[PDB]
Amino acid sequence: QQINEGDFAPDFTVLDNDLNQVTLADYAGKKKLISVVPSIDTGVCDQQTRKFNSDASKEEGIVLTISADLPFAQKRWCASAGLDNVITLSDHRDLSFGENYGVVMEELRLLARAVFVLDADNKVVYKEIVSEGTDFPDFDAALAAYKNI
Amino acid sequence: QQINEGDFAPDFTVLDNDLNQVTLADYAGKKKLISVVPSIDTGVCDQQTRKFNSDASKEEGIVLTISADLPFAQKRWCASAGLDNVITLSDHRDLSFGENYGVVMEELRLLARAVFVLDADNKVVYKEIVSEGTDFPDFDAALAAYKNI
């Protein structure tokens, strides 16, 4: 479905690294920067995940990384990066998040590179679906929208 | 839906680590030991993959590891293991292999731990689906069936 800035963000069901079900309500009351990647096991998506996590204030809100990687890959990625403060969530089972946010690459069954910023009421205050041929998402614009809440 | 010993091996379409499509015909004329795992990023499935690849003679035939891991996870796994001869194939897009061979855990969208041994005519000469609550596949029985072809 198509996400528009100003709308309230739809809910979704994804899996954390321990296979617990996670929904948007698990981060109630917080602003969210949602960084969506095709796979954390590719270099550009690795860099995108690290930069949003290091540059966003995590005492201010939450940075979620969502992909169709299996939970097992996301857990192993965090361990190899040596990072215990990074949230990774897996949309592999149902593409609940991908379908609700309009970011499924259907022929690949992977999620498109994308960034959403939600305020603490889950109003969508920023959206980028990264265009083809673009090197990286606009980190600064997304970080500014997240910081401005 | 159900493959039994004495049945013929179904076709499948899966992805190699470079996202090329791979089918049963790519292994024509060889016998096959097909090791199916929920995820190569879990220690038990890592052990199962290493054991079948080390113990099976690879110039009598082919050892295939098939799972719903993304190709990127399988590619990284082979690189980090320093294992450039180990074939891993991803069923993530379609569950083509899992559905054809009756080994999808539908509630998880992961493949059940299982072993199929195919002779060079693609007769299934041995099959095990590891029951829940059993520690490991019967490596010795599967390897003996493969050696005896």
Automatic annotation (TrEMBL), chains A, B:
Protein's GO biological process: cellular response to oxidative stress
A Pfam family it matches: Redoxin
Stored CDD domains: PRX_Atyp2cys
Residues in Thioredoxin domain copies: 3-148
First and last residue of the signal peptide: none
Domain of life: Bacteria
Active site location: 45
Catalytic activity: a hydroperoxide + [thioredoxin]-dithiol = an alcohol + [thioredoxin]-disulfide + H2O
UniProt entry keywords in alphabetical sequence: Antioxidant, Disulfide bond, Oxidoreductase, Peroxidase, Redox-active center
Role according to the record: Thiol-specific peroxidase that catalyzes the reduction of hydrogen peroxide and organic hydroperoxides to water and alcohols, respectively. Plays a role in cell protection against oxidative stress by detoxifying peroxides.
PANTHER family: THIOL PEROXIDASE
Subunit structure: Homodimer.
Protein name: Thiol peroxidase
Organism field: Staphylococcus aureus (strain NCTC 8325 / PS 47)
